[PDB]
Paper text:
The CRAFSSDD/[name]/14-3-3 open monomer cryo-EM map has a nominal resolution of 3.9 Å (unmasked), and despite use of a 30° tilt in data acquisition, still suffers somewhat from missing orientations. Nevertheless, the map clearly reveals key structural features – the [name] pSer621 phosphosite is bound on one side of the 14-3-3 dimer, and the [name] kinase domain contacts the opposite protomer of the 14-3-3. The phosphopeptide recognition groove on this side of the 14-3-3 is unoccupied, confirming that the [name] pSer259 motif is not engaged in this state. Notably, there is a visible gap between the [name] and [name] kinase domains and the 14-3-3 dimer with no apparent density for the CRD, indicating that it is released and does not interact with 14-3-3 in the open monomer state. The 14-3-3 contacts the C-lobe of [name] in a loop region ([name] residues 238-241) and makes a glancing contact at Pro346. As compared with the intact autoinhibited state, the 14-3-3 domain in the open monomer is re-oriented to expose the dimerization interface of the kinase domain. Although the 14-3-3 remains bound to the pSer621 site, it rotates by ~180° and shifts by ~35 Å such that it no longer sterically occludes the kinase dimerization interface. The open monomer structures also indicate that the pSer259 site is exposed for dephosphorylation in this state. Datasets used for the CRAFSSDD kinase domain open monomer and CRAFSSDD open monomer were recorded from the same grid, the latter at a 30° tilt to mitigate the effects of a preferred orientation of these particles. We propose that the open monomer state represents an intermediate between the closed, autoinhibited state and the active dimer configuration.
[name] ([name]) is one of three [name]-family kinases that initiate MAP kinase signaling in response to activated RAS and is essential for oncogenic signaling from mutant KRAS. Like BRAF, [name] is regulated by 14-3-3 engagement and by intramolecular autoinhibitory interactions of its N-terminal regulatory region. Here we describe cryo-EM reconstructions of full-length [name] in complex with [name] and a 14-3-3 dimer. These structures reveal a fully autoinhibited conformation analogous to that observed for BRAF and two “open monomer” states in which the inhibitory interactions of the CRD and 14-3-3 dimer are released or rearranged, but the kinase domain remains inactive.
Author numbering:
A (entry chain B): 62 to 266, 307 to 380
B (entry chain A): 343 to 625
C (entry chain C), D (entry chain D): 2 to 230
The structure:
């Protein structure tokens, strides 16, 4: 198994509302992994249940899903051990590059759809957290998903967290409603929009998190600025950012959408561009 | 301020919304919270020291002692250590079984402490179950009060003026941020009412919601309120009336804390000794 | 006086006694005066708890009867007790319907009230159906079908897609389709359609009725996945 | 035959149907057959549930009765309804007392069983004393005191202080002292003595006697904590 003592932290990869992830080395194996510590105060039975639910991640093997080695509870914190992602998160790259190139955005959308359909098919799991900070990249050019809702009890525990700044919640999910994968698709669309423009698009060209939610519930969905993007991409994102879940395209429609096909046909040196924009 | 060489940091305790708590031994056992603010603005630092002085001025039984601050080991604040576990741990993590009069007395002590703070024009934002400790078995100790200028970030010489901390105890009128200064006495009253709900239910409000943003939106819209159906059956009727009055969506509807204390005293007067006795179970 | 009888029924409700409550409300119904919106809720809840207790009892009795799997007098006595409690439930439901098809459905000015009462009628016919096995099952099943359909027409006609009454009617009818008629495809279709129609008009949700709306919505979601498996 | 009625009572228990179990046990004991531990335990459980529901209801009714005295004649019918509840409350206890007088007390060949039956008699007299007022209350409590004292001597002479029945007897006696006699010091002294004896004679119980005994001791500590403050 995995225990606290077997890891020597190398660095702090980052910190979000939920917790903090450290790039550490597993001493018995000598490999660098990422260990996410989430602080929470729950009963030991809940902790055991959450560990058991996270044990499912052993067989969730996909080129579009981050790796996983184990999880344990050391002291008031749940520790999650996953493979180390060299490129970090797409939010980091958005901090590096002003705005993502459209070809790379297409490749990103292809990877995200592949991951979401892999989850919904072989695990019946909804990500529930499709965000720029939750998509990870590698030095070899791979794109993968992390921080998806495998453990329901863990989600219930994280329901007790501190207020946020920005949100990637589909308006149906804010309205106490859920349309299976359409909400994850809406999150994907908002992530691609926020990556295309060099800003958070919800206050379209600051506002409190409540005002952001009120806007994304009671206002028209954001759109890419026309004239600086191809038509297939704008149509794809307008399909993804649809208020009505039924009219919102599912995974199958997006897979054969024109923008996705155009992105798949194109050859993009994603690894080289990443190395350039992050050094 | 306080010299960092005087204090000695023991093993870490945990992390919170705006700081990380370690055990210290300066002039006895203390708690040192390392603040997350990295580069305090000079105006921010001056306001921080003003609030620190005001907090050192406080002296009450149900509120922890605020020793002072230090600027050497980053920016940190020193408070009186309490060995007793937090009320949140007792109700939820420990699921400690409290009798009805015990909970009434806990609520009365907490109301006394909050009344002390509000008598001094100190707004204990982030007032909640983790900020309440059961010192010496049943004494209530209130912590992490005030500190407006540190919990909220600062955009240079201007405070960010955005909500922070746990949302379950967050008042609706402060979730909306419909005013630049939504923090006042009534927000504390609402947070205290949520604490009362946890006491009288033993469970967190909005257990059916498992997304924080959904909670934010629904509470801000008024579409969700703590359901009083979870309240304990043995809970006195006036107690349920009080916990209903405290969590009123209307800001002006929530009563002030002197009224809270008066109501709790009347409840303790009316508290009979009939249902209190428990008989043999159907073993 | 009507107010004293309603206060007594509410008091028995607060006392967790659901026999003096049901009788008190039936006596109120026997007055032959039209109910108000508040008073209807007490009647519904009381006769709902009365029926649910016997339903749970019947479920556990039937589970034990299918669990024993032996050859002795215990199974016969369990069957006798099952038919006893079943007869009690039948009497309860028949008293309910006679109270309904003689004072409430015939005299209901408000169409919403008629939707409510036809919903009740279908629900109690379903309760009679799930226990009655044989030739008589087909009659109560079809009567429940007619009550549900008549309620559904009025709901689709003059009811909001987000009103709790209509959502509950849709849920009840989907459960009736899935369990009684054993037609999962059409039940799933009805649930999906009701889900979508409620999703469309989510912005129109006042403080008067919000918790019930999302509660029934989550129940519909749960039923959906339960059946899509 | 006897086992058939035992199975019927068990089935009524599983079905949450208690009045059926109460009658099914009252007919069992009416014969006067040799009573085993399980057989008497089921009767105690059934009767206890039936009267507990109604006594909780009465506590609620009496609490509501004193909610507001400055009103019209709404309390007039409330007190009559409470009288109705007591009429449906005293007579069951009297039936149990007559049952205990019929076979239970004479058909006792084990002092433990006599302790248990006298404990039950005192418990139900205590329940009657709560509703009973005036000289009636004193008349009832004089019987419960004597039953409790005759139970305590046999419990001390024949059973270990750690015995769960004896622990429960001490607990119930303490409760009666506190609630009716309003003698909190004597109740506290008795409870402390019983708990101290239980601690002094510990870690000698059977494997089965490791949950009930601990639960009774925990409840004793809870009562001690309540009465100290
Ligand atoms: N396997 C990994 N490799 C590299 N960096 C990682 C890895 N996992 C997480 N991170 C980093 O962890 C940082 C914090 O992300 P999370 O802890 O998942 O919370 P989050 O993405 O910030 O979501 P919120 O809403 O802000 S809490 C991200 O910005 C990533 O850079
Ligand atoms: N005065 C104190 N003495 C001892 N431990 C404390 C004290 N205050 C807080 N703690 C501990 O510090 C950890 C985190 O507490 P905090 O940092 O105050 O965060 P919080 O109390 O959960 O909520 P906030 O809004 O961040 S104060 C928990 O394990 C507490 O038990
Ligand atoms: O970490 C989480 N979120 O972080 C950002 C906000 O979602 C997270 C959130 C919910 C959740 C439910 N069950 C596990 N959960 C998480 N952990 C997690 C799961 C799978 C992998 I692979 C890696 C992980 F870190
Ligand atoms: Mg994250
Ligand atoms: Mg704290």
């Amino acid at each position: 198994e995995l225990k606290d003592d077997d890891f020597e932290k190398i660095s702090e990869l980052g910190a979000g509302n939920g917790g903090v992830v450290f790039k550490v080395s597993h001493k018995p194996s000598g490999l660098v992994m990422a260990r996410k510590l989430i602080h929470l105060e729950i009963k030991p039975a809940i902790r055991n249940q959450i560990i058991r639910e996270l044990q499912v991640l052993h067989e969730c093997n996909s080129p579009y899903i981050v790796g996983f080695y184990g999880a344990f509870y050391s002291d008031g914190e749940i520790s999650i051990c996953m493979e180390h992602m060299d490129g970090g998160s797409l939010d980091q790259v958005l901090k590096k590059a002003g705005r993502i190139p459209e070809q790379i955005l297409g490749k990103v959308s292809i990877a995200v759809i592949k991951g979401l359909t892999y989850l919904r098919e072989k695990h019946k799991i909804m990500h529930r957290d499709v965000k720029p900070s939750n998509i990870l990249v590698n030095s070899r050019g791979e794109i993968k998903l992390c921080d998806f809702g495998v453990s329901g009890q863990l989600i219930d525990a994280m329901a007790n967290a501190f207020v946020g700044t920005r949100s990637y919640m589909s308006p149906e999910r804010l309205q106490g409603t859920h349309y299976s994968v359409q909400s994850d698709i809406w999150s994907m669309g908002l992530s691609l929009v926020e990556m295309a423009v060099g800003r958070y698009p919800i206050p379209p060209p600051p506002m409190a998190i409540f005002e952001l939610l009120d806007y994304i519930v009671n206002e028209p969905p954001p759109k890419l600025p026309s004239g600086v993007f191809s038509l297939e991409f704008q149509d794809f994102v307008n399909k993804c950012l649809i208020k009505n879940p039924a009219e919102r395209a599912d995974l199958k429609q997006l897979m054969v959408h024109a923008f996705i096909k155009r992105s798949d046909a194109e050859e993009v040196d994603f690894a080289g561009w990443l190395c350039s924009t992050i050094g | 301020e306080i010299e960092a060489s005087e204090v000695m940091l023991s093993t870490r305790i945990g992390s919170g919304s705006f700081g990380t708590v370690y055990k210290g031994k300066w002039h006895g056992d203390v708690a040192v919270k390392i603040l997350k603010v990295v580069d305090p603005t000079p105006e921010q630092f001056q306001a921080f020291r003003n609030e620190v002085a005001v907090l050192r001025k406080t002296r009450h039984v149900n509120i922890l002692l605020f020793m002072g601050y230090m600027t050497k080991d980053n920016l940190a604040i020193v408070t009186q250590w309490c060995e007793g576990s937090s009320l949140y741990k007792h109700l939820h993590v420990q699921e400690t079984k409290f009798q009805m009069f015990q909970l009434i007395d806990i609520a009365r002590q907490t109301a006394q402490g909050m009344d002390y703070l509000h008598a001094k024009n100190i707004i204990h934002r982030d007032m909640k179950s983790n900020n309440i400790f059961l010192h010496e078995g049943l004494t209530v100790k209130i912590g992490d009060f005030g500190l407006a200028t540190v919990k909220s970030r600062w955009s240079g010489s201007q405070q960010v003026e955005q909500p922070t901390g746990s949302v379950l105890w967050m008042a609706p009128e402060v979730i909306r941020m419909q005013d630049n200064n939504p923090f006042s006495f009534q927000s504390d009253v609402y947070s205290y009412g949520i604490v009362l709900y946890e006491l009288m239910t033993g469970e967190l409000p909005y257990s059916h919601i498992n997304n924080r943003d959904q909670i934010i939106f629904m509470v801000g819209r008024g579409y969700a309120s703590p359901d009083l159906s979870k309240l304990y059956k043995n809970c006195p009727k006036a107690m349920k009336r009080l916990v209903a009055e405290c969590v009123k969506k209307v800001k002006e509807e929530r009563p002030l804390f002197p009224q809270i204390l008066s109501s709790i005293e009347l409840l303790q007067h009316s508290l009979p000794k009939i249902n209190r006795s428990a008989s043999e179970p159907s073993l | 006086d009507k107010e004293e009888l309603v206060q007594r029924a509410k008091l028995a409700e607060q006392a967790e006694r659901y026999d003096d409550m049901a009788a008190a409300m039936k006596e109120v119904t026997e007055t032959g005066v039209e109910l108000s919106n508040e008073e209807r809720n007490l009647l519904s809840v009381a006769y709902k708890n009365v029926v649910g207790a016997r339903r749970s009892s019947w479920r556990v009795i039937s589970s034990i009867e299918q669990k024993t799997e032996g050859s002795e007098r215990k199974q016969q006595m369990a069957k006798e007790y099952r038919v006893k409690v079943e007869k009690e439930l039948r009497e309860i439901c028949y008293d309910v319907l006679g109270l309904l098809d003689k004072h409430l459905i015939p005299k209901a000015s408000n169409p919403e009230s008629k939707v409510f009462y036809l919903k009740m009628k279908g629900d109690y016919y379903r309760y009679l159906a799930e226990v009655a096995t044989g030739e008589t099952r087909n009659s109560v099943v079809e009567d429940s079908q007619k009550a549900y359909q008549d309620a559904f027409e009025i709901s689709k006609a003059k009811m909001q897609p987000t009103h709790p009454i209509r959502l509950g009617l849709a849920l009840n009818f989907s459960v009736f389709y899935y369990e009684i008629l054993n037609s999962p495809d059409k039940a799933c279709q009805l649930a999906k359609q009701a889900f979508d129609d409620a999703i469309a008009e989510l912005d129109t949700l006042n403080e008067d009725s919000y918790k019930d709306s999302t509660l029934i919505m989550q129940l519909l979601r749960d039923n959906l996945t339960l059946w899509t498996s």
